[PDB]
Every structure is written in structure tokens, then in C-alpha cells.
Design a protein around this ligand. Structure first.
Ligand SMILES: Nc1ncnc2c1ncn2[C@@H]1O[C@H](COP(=O)(O)OP(=O)(O)O)[C@@H](O)[C@H]1O
Ligand SMILES: Nc1ncnc2c1ncn2[C@@H]1O[C@H](COP(=O)(O)OP(=O)(O)O)[C@@H](O)[C@H]1O
Ligand SMILES: Nc1ncnc2c1ncn2[C@@H]1O[C@H](COP(=O)(O)OP(=O)(O)O)[C@@H](O)[C@H]1O
Ligand SMILES: Nc1ncnc2c1ncn2[C@@H]1O[C@H](COP(=O)(O)OP(=O)(O)O)[C@@H](O)[C@H]1O
Ligand SMILES: [Mg+2]
Ligand SMILES: [Mg+2]
Ligand SMILES: [Mg+2]
Ligand SMILES: [Mg+2]
Lengths: 372, 372, 372, 372
């Protein structure tokens, strides 16, 4: 039919589904794995490459790799496999019949977008296309028109102030702190005890450990003193092989580098100061409205105590006269996809498509004159 | 019905209302604003131009401009929008059924008046018209027949001696000092401290600051010495963003340039000497009556200590034999409109209109033979 | 040597030169200018006052003022500077060696003449002095003995009937219309269009414009109708800044107030009626000779069509029996100086001087018993 | 000895030298750097702070900061270190024996100047002091007395009209566009390709890239079309690590925001319109002389095609009658210092000093009554 499709692929996660719904239909990690050992059976295996859930299921004898890194595609041959798997082995749909909507982080090379649209038009033969900023759809999902948006995932962390539909492009900030840095720091600090992890499967195990038992401390020094004094903060985790591990003060030291980037050697400011700097670069009249409409989205902002910690950090910098409010919906993980699905079903979003006639009459460089 | 309308369109404010009343019905600034940033929403806004209170409400993302400057219309395309908004979105009246009265400052180009009447007749199709001098209606509002009138606003400052209904046109003086010059000087002298304002919204903020905390010192040198010695004259103001500012001796240095125009580089005499020069150019017999019937009107003359300061300045120049009196009614801000409403309801003011038959039989150049 | 000097100091010009010649040697305006802005250079200028041509050359940063007003000296400290500049920086002569002749308008305060002679004797130490009426020397320059003389400049306009060397002092009329009033009226009526002039330098520019493009219309109503119908009377002028201006019917409306003083608010009669009234106050027998010997002098009478207009105006009032003739020499501008130089070289004009012995034996009040 | 010293401390560079010379003796950037990495050696370094050339030499392990920002000193503890290094480690002179001359941009807080003189007198014990406007010394260096001066550096851009030594303080304009904004915009637009720079050392690298390969296009649209068509404008640069980078149309897009401030979000007019507005606010008589004596100074005006571009822009606004000339000496970078050295050696500049007796008899607030 004419129903549009939404595919919000990320640094390490891909969510695809039909438009007009309220939840993604296919969510799976974007990894590609190949075997490394020798095959001795008459079959010696079945295939030479695994993409999707089966790659992680058989990760014990595979070398997993991520096509996308820091939000920029580096391997242009695995993305074709991933998109083919998404379109055929996950949705069972013919791409030559439905429009496709894609999302991309701001401040990225134009060659990436041009190659993306060129290989999307000339390989899958979709009849329409559009590329939208990830953080813009967060306001659509929330149902607002003004407010600064913070989005964090496996890629980059970026802010964009929007006021009554007129976004300011001269106050957009972008960082390079994400889940991969957090799990690498957790892997490094886990070597402090006897545990050691070097393999990609062990990297996935450490990622799962970070997802399960982690939180953000309201006060770092007091939490450190309590952990060193009472030693009642320890948790227990069970490895697949059967052994158990115990972690104490490392639980709240993993998200701390998100607020103090000096832990991993980066020279920058935390997420509490970047938002304040972005706010103070806007106009004087609209500062008050943005201060009381903070919006949070993305998986990385799913930690328990992030909201109170960020509110406390922001309230110190801002003047005491006004109020600071942070909006953290419980379903903020699948927020970009919901906004994209809402946008794709609008009545006025019908002449904003990029038809194939325009593409093959002008060229791949048309995406720079029709998308923000 | 046949009720007339009065529309006093000043250089920085517009006041419109029906005749026969005692207070304007619609008072709003005359500014036009357009957006400058980019729209990213599916709506990207609603309109492309804002005129009236909504333009100032959304001034954070707009570029505000004034159609009228120094009392002379420079943009003839925004005045149509402003008058349409006044007639339709403020009064909810049909212009083709009621006469309209307009005010204009003396000593202005005739092309301005001719274009005004030409576009008022041929676009809104009013059945009558009349243009009257702004300072003449001040006497009507006061309820007198003799006395020199001083009017100051956002445009020009002009005096016109009137004695028993026979005004003298050879003793009319006009200056170019108004609220815009005062707020520009305040903006310049505010850079003396750390505060800096460059944007039009910041210009409006400075105008509000001038309106709130300003006064006129009786003695400049003594006030300067007191401010430099005791430092008890400082006031505090709160910016919209939340920050606070403090102003000391700058409070009484803003209206000082009205009495000493050399501060802003102009080579002229203050308002205390212009009135004396205008009085001394009249006849010997009527000098005494004009000296004891000073009349003040306009917003710019709303400062606290202006009356005593001007009386003290005038008494020094005039001979000590007679008396000098200054009349400053508390409602002098809406003085021209009250006089116009009083004049438009008079029984003898019925054959002085400019009917459409005369206009389309003679031409737009008839306004020079029926209005003073 | 013993050669006399002649110094005609008018209300707006100074002409000085040696006696026995036929043309003034030094002609320059009588203005004094002082700076108003701040000096930031290590020199910050050279002097604190400029008098003569250099004052007008640097008029952009000076405040020009005229010592003489309406023919009466008001500033007695700038006249010393002007006369010192004339005697030393223009003629390179020692005043203590040559007699000096001065001119003064009739019907002036005696204190002015007494102060003039007192400060001329006691400061420059001239050995002789004489003061003569300006309009008397016009007949000497023309070479006649009977005829009414009309003189107009930047000061006052005065008539004096003279018949065979016996002037009648009871029929002398004096007005107060001059070039300053004409240029002020031109400045006022130039505000009718977009052009506006307020500064003294702009006053000089308007004076130059009046000097260049002005004339007198023979018939006012017909000229007005022609200007309003054909619009072929417009001229173009170039301002120093580079902009151009256009003037139409204002060309012949500037000298009209000389014939109809009601334009500038004055209540009097034009120059055509003052001469007739002066003639009709004389004796019956000498009326015919004065009617046919009109004499014109002064700069203000240098307009193109003044002679024919005045002849037409006079012929209507006078009886049709006799003839009316007006004498307007092409060199009438420097007419008083020529007459003074002719008078100072006469053989019988040697015992009419005012020696220093008489001055210091009688007093400054001797000038009233030796000069007319 | 009694030889004076000149120390021009800009927003990004410091130039100091003895008076009476023709070239600065010590030119070095004004940055302060501190280490941020751990020290493991028995020395762990030598010092804790680096100021001058050594700070930039070891910039790989330091955090560089600028004490001055937008022309206003923000860190009052690093300026003491910088001035001590200048006086002792660069010139090898005792400050208690020589007078010192300092320069400061116009329209700055008075507290800055008062603190500067207070800490210069009470810490280094200099026997004399004077503060002069930066743009005034440009005329001294050129050797003129009239002409508008444009100065641009790392701080602010300001114009001041001067005519025969009488500067007009009511027509002085000041902007906030400088080299820092240009290099920030270049850093932002370099992210369009794969290159990314976030560190202060990378900021210095981008500044060097801007200094080396940049120019101003005469026509923006034609240059854009040529760059997009031929692609022959690309240049190559070599990074310290060994990699090479290529830049195409970004070469002429960096100085474009100096003429169109809307690129970086600022709401103002380019340098071509600010000069015209400043000229048109002066007097009518002096407009022609200022138009034909444009003066350019400062490092930011060192771009190749700036002169022709600015002349073309100005000629369009100005009337076609007169001529527009721009003076751009090849040594305009060290123009303020040359003018200061010329001024400090003048014979009349000996009683204009601020002796210590006046300072300790009156107070730090004396600098407002002796310097412009
Ligand atoms: N409950 C949780 N607690 C902590 N971290 C989480 C949680 N859920 C998800 N994450 C983190 O969020 C990341 C997923 O982000 P994602 O939504 O895929 O961003 P994108 O779609 O831009 O790639 C994972 O790397 C994971 O570390
Ligand atoms: N209370 C006040 N104190 C000082 N200034 C005032 C006050 N109220 C109004 N004004 C000044 O008066 C001006 C408004 O003049 P206005 O009445 O609009 O004149 P016009 O109608 O001729 O435009 C404003 O610019 C403002 O600066
Ligand atoms: N060609 C001309 N056309 C019109 N007016 C002129 C002309 N030449 C001079 N004038 C006027 O004559 C005046 C000079 O008069 P002047 O001879 O100085 O009288 P006085 O010597 O008594 O001061 C000037 O103000 C000027 O306006
Ligand atoms: N050859 C050049 N090309 C382009 N820009 C230059 C060149 N030389 C210097 N600059 C710029 O000039 C600036 C230095 O200005 P400077 O003379 O230090 O001003 P100030 O002395 O007021 O700080 C540097 O930031 C640099 O970007
Ligand atoms: Mg995401
Ligand atoms: Mg008004
Ligand atoms: Mg004369
Ligand atoms: Mg500089």
C-alpha cells in the first residue's frame, strides 16, 4: 500500500516499523559477525556471515563489528546487508512500494548523507525519501513546540534549542560521549579487581552488566565515603559460565564520566554545563521558556538518578529567581521513532518528499536543498 | 452609525477610538516584525508578519521596525497593514460607514499628507476626512482659548502660540528631540558599566527601564555631587533572563540632554529657551497672557520633576515683575485624543468635512485648501 | 603716507581699501567662529578663534556668529578682533599713520557711534576720523546732486530724499527687511519639501542657494499659475555632500516678502509704497525731479527683475502725466565704498576731519556736533 | 634612562618596545597555560604555569587560556604574570625607572581602566602613566590629521571620525566581530568534511590555517558558482601529525561573515555599512574629506582582497559625484605601536603625563580627568 516506513538505525541499535503505529515492530542490534575458527564438519557451517540476533546468539565463534561509529558510517558494504535484512527478513515487505524516512545526527559529513540517499535510491528503488534530524522528532513525540532537547545514545550527544518552531542553528552543540565510552571505562575499571575482559563477547557481557546494575549518585563525595565505610552497596552478577562477580563502588563511577569527562582523558564540560552554555547563547527573551521545558530522550538517559542529579546541577548555575523543570517520560527510549511516525502521517507532509523524478533530474546533491 | 472615529497615530504609539467618549479604546505600539531564523517544524510558524502586541510578545525571534520616523512616514506598505489591523482586528468596524479624523505634526512635507489622504480615500473608502494639528487639540482638551502649547512624544517637539483662537504661524518652532534619542543616549551610557545592549528587543528593554526609573534633577551640579558623595541614589532592576542590574547617577542624566542638547552632539537650545524665544517673537501686548498659561502635553513630559525644573528655568529668563505658571494635568498623556474627540462632536464641525465628491471632483491636492 | 582709508563694515560683509582707488582691496564676511567639539590630537588645533575667510572655510566644526545685527553692534569684543584682522592681516598697514572713514546707517543709537569713535581713537590711535551716512555716498558714486536713494543690504532698508545737496531729514524712512529675513524665510519654506536645515553652516548653504537661483516675478498670480501648470521653472542644485536638490515655485517666493511683508508676519508696506510715501512727504515743487531720478544701491537690490517690477509698481501709484525712471548701475554692489573714496579725496574735505586734539580736548561726545 | 616604553596589549597579541624606535622589540601572544596530565618523573615537570612562547611550544599537555576577552580583562591574576614576564623576561628592564604608555579600546567599562592604573602604579611603581585610544594613534602612524579610521583585531571593531584634530565622539561605532569569531566559524564549517577539531591546540591549528590560506572574494555568487563548477580553488595543508587536508570553497566563506554577520547569527550590518552610517552621522561639510581618506589598520584587515571589496561596496552606497579612496599600508599590522612611539617622543607630550604625586594626592579616579 501507500503506508510509509520508519527506520531509525543508531550507533548500536536498529528500530524499524510501519507509519501510523505507536511502537516499533522490529528492534535489533546492528552488528555483523564472521567466523574465525576452522570448520571440520562436512557442512563446516551454513553461511559465512551473520547479521542481527543470530550473530549475537552465536557470538562465541564470531567476530562482531559495528558498521556505524560516532554516528558516521565507516563500512559501506555491511550497511547494505543490514538494510536488506531489515527490509526482507524482518518486515517481509517490498521496498519498491513504500516511502522511507531516515534519521541522521546533526553536524555530520555531507558525503555520508549523499551516499546514503544514492544507495537507497539506486539499490532498493524506493519511490520517496526524506532525512530528518533526530532531536527534532523528540518534540513531536512529546507534543510541544518550544524547549531544548537533549539526546544521548551509542553515537553522539547533541543539543538543539527550538522556540515555537524556529530552531536556532548557531547554538547547536555536539559531544562524543556515549554508551561505548561508558562500557569501555567500565571494562578498564573492572580490571582493578581480578576480572579481566578482552573479547567482543566479553564487551557485550560488560554492556549487559552496565545496563543491569548501574545508577547515578546525587553527591559523589558522600557516596564514595558511604561506600568506603559501610560497604553495603555491593551487588552480585552471574556470568554465563557459572561464576559470580561482585561490584561495589564501581556502580556509580561509570556514569560519573558523563558529568566529569576528565575521567576518560577528554577535555570538555559535562552535560550539565553544555546545556547551560547552549541556553546562554540564545536570545535574552526566550531564555526563561527554554529553562522550564528541558526534554530528555535516548537510551543513555535511562539511568535512575539522572533527572534529579541534572536538576540539582542546573539549578546552581541558573539564577534563583526562576524555576528549572526536566521532562523525562518513562518511554523516552523509543522517542525518535514515535516522533517520526507522527510526522510521516501528517496531512501537510505530502509535498515535502523527494520523488525519484527530482533525484534523476537533478542528482544526488538534491538532499542538501530539501532537508535540514 | 454616523459616529466619527479618532485615530492618533504617533511615532511610537497608536490610539484609536470612537468619538464622544473620554478615553481611547485601543492603544498599542506601531511596530512591524518579521522572523529571521529558520523554521524546522512542519508548520514552521503560522504567518510571515506580526503587527501590534503579538509582534512585541514574540519579539525574541523577530526584527521589529517602526514605519514612522521623526514624524514622517518612510514605509508606505506597513502603514496599510497597521491601519487594517486597527480598523478590523482592534475595533471590529467597517471603515466605509464612519468619518475618520487624523492628526499630523506641523512643518511636515505636503507629499506625506497628500499620500495619506489619497490612500485613505481609495483603499478603505471612508466617506469623510479631516486632518488637524496635534498641538491645537491640546487647548480643546484643556478647555482654554489662549496659551502656548508644548507637546513632546516619540516624534518631534513643537510649540505654537495661540491667543483667543488666532494662532500665530510665524512663531512656530520645531525640534527633533524625542524618546528615541533619550533611549539611544541611555543605551550608550549604559555601556559605561558592564551591561551591553545591541538588539531591538534590548532596545525595548532599555525603553522600559527608562520609563520605570528616571527623573529630572532640579540642580544638576548639586545632584551630581550628592550622587558621587553619598551613593544613595542607586536603584535595582530585574532583567527577563533573571539577572539584576544597578543604576546610579544615570537616572537623571537621561532627561538632561532634553535641557542641554549638546550631550548628543546636537547644536540647539533646550526646551526652556525655545519657549522663551517663541514667546518673545509674538506681540508685546499678548506676552503677559501666554507667560501665565503654559500648557504641557505628550508622554515625554511625564517625568516627575519636569514641571518645577522648567518653571525655575523660565523664571530666570523672564522679567521678575509678572508670574509664570505651568499647567500639567495628570492625564496629559492622552490629551490629543481627548481634544480630537471633543472637536469631532461639535455642532459647528459638520460642514468642515472633506466629502468624497470634493475629492473626486478636485483631486488629492484639496487637503491643502481645507486643513491648517 | 597721508593716503586715507575707507572701511565699509556692513551687517554681513566688510570692504576695506585705500582712498583714491576705484575698487575695494579686501572684501570678506564679518563672522567670528569658535570650535565646539573635543580635541584629541597633541595639537588639538592651533587657535581658539577664527575670523574672516578661514572661519567659513573650517565652518564644519565651528559656531559662526555675527557681531552686527540690524545695523547695531551687539558684541563689542569681536569687533576689535575683526578690525585688527582688517588692519593687520588684510592690508598690512599701521593704523597710527592714516585717517579712517566709517559709514553708519541713519536712525541708530548715539551710544553706538560714541563707543565706535571712543574705541577707534583709544585703541588703534588713528589721527583723524569721520562718520558719514551710507545712502549719501550713493549719489557721490553716481555723480548726481538730486534724487531719492534706496539702499538695501544685510542690515536695514532706508530712504533719504536729497535735492540739490539739501537733504530733508523729516522724510527719512527706515525698515527692517534684509537678506537675513529672506534667507530665514527660504529656510522655512524649504522644509515644505524633504530638505531640512538647522545649522549655521546650513544657513550659509541656504544663503548661497538664494544668491544663485532666485529672481523676482513681474506678476505674482500669473507666475504662480504657470508654475503650477507647466512645471518648467524647476532648477537643480548640488549640495557639498553630493546630493542634489530641486526647487520650483520657491524661486520667486523668496523676494516676494520684500514687496509683501505680511508673509513673514511683519505689518508694514513694501519697498514700492515706502518710496512713494517718502516722495509725497516732500515739497510740491521738488516731487517731479525726485520721481525721475530713482537711485538703487546695495546687494539686496541685485535681483534680475527688481527694476521692472518696481517701475511697474510705482507707475500705478504716481499720476500718469509725468515719467518714472529707475537707475540701476551694474556695479551697484560696491557703490557706498566708491562714493566714500571719491569724497575722501576731495580738496574741500580737509578741514572736516576730527583731529585727536579736538577729541581729547572736548570728549567722545564731539561726533554729534561734526557728523550728520 | 628616561626613555619611555610602549606596550600594546591586544586581545590576542602583546607588542612591547622602547620609544623612539620604528619596530616592536618583543611580540608574543598573551596566553596562560597549565598542565592537566599526571607527572610520574622525579621532577614531574619544572613549573606549574607557562606564559608566552613556551606555553604554545608545550601546548600539547597544557590548557591555554586568554586573560582578555572582547577587549575587557576578565582574569586579573594572569595579567600580572603576563606583564611581569614582559617587563623582566622579555625586555630586561626595571619598571621603576621608565614611563609607560598603554592603549585601550573605546567604549569600555571605567572599572577596567581604574583597576589597570591602580595595579600598574602600586605593583610595578612606574613614575608616569598615560592611556590613549588605539584608533587615534593610527593617524599619527600614517601622518595625517583628518580621516575615518577602521581598526580590527582579536577584540572589537571600532570606527572614530577625526577631522583636523577634532574627533566627534557622538559618531563612534563599536562591533564585536574579530579573529576569534572567524576561527570559530572556520572550526564549525570544517566539521562539514571529515575533519574535527575540539581542543585548544586544535583551535591554534585552525587559526594558523586561517592565517595561511584565506582570502576575500570580490563577488560571492560568482565565486561560489566557479568553485562548484571548476573545483580548481582547492588547497592543501599539512597537519603536524603528518596527515594532509584539503579545503575548497571554505577559503572565502570565512571572511564573508565579516561582511554578512548573519552567518554567525549576529543581528547587525557589515563593516561596509557601519563606516557609511558613521560618515552620514557627521556634518555635511566634512563628509567629502572623510570619504576620500579611509584608513585601515589591524591584523584582521590583512586579507588580500579586502581593499577592493570594501571600495566596491562603499562606492555603491555613496553618491557617484565624488571619489572614494582607501589607504592600506603594507605595514598596517604594527600601526598602533608606531603611532604610540611617535606620540611618546613629542616635545609637547611632557606635561600630559600622570605623575605619582597626582595619583597619591587625588586617587585612582584621576585617569578619567586626564585621558580621552
Ligand atoms: N536500562 C538502562 N540502563 C542503562 N543504560 C541503558 C538502559 N537501556 C539502554 N541503555 C543504553 O542505551 C544504549 C542504546 O541507545 P539507543 O537507544 O540504541 O541509541 P541509538 O538509537 O541512537 O543508537 C545502549 O548502549 C545501552 O548502554
Ligand atoms: N511614565 C513615564 N515616564 C517617562 N517616560 C514616559 C512615561 N510614559 C511614557 N513615556 C515616554 O513617552 C513616549 C510615548 O509618547 P506618545 O504619547 O506615544 O507620543 P506620540 O503619541 O506622539 O507617539 C514613550 O516613548 C515613552 O518613552
Ligand atoms: N547676485 C545676487 N543675487 C541675490 N542676492 C545677492 C546677490 N549678491 C549679493 N546678494 C545679497 O546681498 C547681501 C550682501 O549685502 P551687502 O552689500 O554686504 O550689504 P552691507 O554692505 O550693507 O552689509 C547678501 O546677504 C546677499 O544675500
Ligand atoms: N596574514 C594574515 N592573514 C589573515 N589574518 C591575519 C594575518 N595576520 C594576522 N591575522 C589575524 O590578525 C589577528 C591578530 O590581531 P592583532 O594585531 O593581535 O590585534 P590586537 O593587537 O588588537 O590584538 C590574528 O588573530 C590573526 O587571525
Ligand atoms: Mg538515537
Ligand atoms: Mg503626540
Ligand atoms: Mg550697505
Ligand atoms: Mg589592536
Amino acid at each position: 500500500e501507500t503506508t510509509a516506513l520508519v527506520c531509525d538505525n543508531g550507533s548500536g541499535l536498529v528500530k524499524a516499523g510501519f507509519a501510523g503505529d505507536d511502537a516499533p515492530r522490529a528492534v535489533f542490534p546492528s552488528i555483523v559477525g564472521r567466523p574465525r575458527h576452522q570448520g571440520v564438519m562436512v557442512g563446516m557451517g551454513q553461511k559465512d556471515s551473520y547479521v542481527g540476533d543470530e550473530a549475537q546468539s552465536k557470538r562465541g565463534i564470531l567476530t562482531l563489528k559495528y558498521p556505524i561509529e560516532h554516528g558516521i558510517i565507516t563500512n559501506w558494504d555491511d550497511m547494505e546487508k543490514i538494510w536488506h535484512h531489515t527490509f526482507y527478513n524482518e518486515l517481509r515487505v517490498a521496498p519498491e512500494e513504500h516511502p522511507t524516512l531516515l534519521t541522521e545526527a546533526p553536524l555530520n559529513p555531507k558525503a555520508n548523507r549523499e551516499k546514503m540517499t544514492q544507495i537507497m535510491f539506486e539499490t532498493f528503488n524506493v519511490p520517496a525519501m526524506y532525512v530528518a534530524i533526530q532531536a527534532v522528532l523528540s518534540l513531536y513525540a512529546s507534543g510541544r513546540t518550544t524547549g531544548i532537547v537533549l539526546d544521548s545514545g551509542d553515537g553522539v550527544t547533541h543539543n538543539v534549542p527550538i522556540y515555537e518552531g524556529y530552531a536556532l542553528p548557531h547554538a547547536i552543540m555536539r559531544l562524543d560521549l556515549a554508551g561505548r565510552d561508558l562500557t569501555d571505562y567500565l571494562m578498564k575499571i573492572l580490571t582493578e579487581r581480578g576480572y579481566s575482559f578482552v573479547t567482543t563477547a566479553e564487551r557485550e557481557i560488560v554492556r549487559d552488566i552496565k545496563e543491569k546494575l548501574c545508577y547515578v549518585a546525587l553527591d559523589f563525595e558522600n557516596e564514595m565515603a558511604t561506600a568506603a565505610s559501610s560497604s553495603s552497596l555491593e551487588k552480585s552478577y552471574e556470568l554465563p559460565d557459572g561464576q559470580v562477580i561482585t561490584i561495589g563502588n564501581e556502580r556509580f563511577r561509570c556514569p560519573e564520566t558523563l558529568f566529569q569527562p576528565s575521567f576518560i582523558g577528554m577535555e570538555s564540560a559535562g552535560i550539565h554545563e553544555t546545556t547551560y552554555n547552549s541556553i546562554m547563547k540564545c536570545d535574552i527573551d526566550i531564555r526563561k521558556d527554554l529553562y522550564a521545558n528541558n526534554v530528555m530522550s535516548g537510551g543513555t538517559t535511562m539511568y535512575p538518578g539522572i533527572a534529579d542529579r541534572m536538576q540539582k546541577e542546573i539549578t546552581a548555575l541558573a539564577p534563583s529567581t526562576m524555576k528549572i523543570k526536566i521532562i523525562a517520560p518513562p518511554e523516552r527510549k523509543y522517542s525518535v521513532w514515535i516522533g517520526g511516525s507522527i510526522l510521516a502521517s501528517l496531512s501537510t507532509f505530502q509535498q515535502m518528499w523527494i520523488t525519484k523524478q527530482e533525484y534523476d533530474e537533478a542528482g544526488p546533491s538534491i538532499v542538501h536543498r530539501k532537508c535540514f
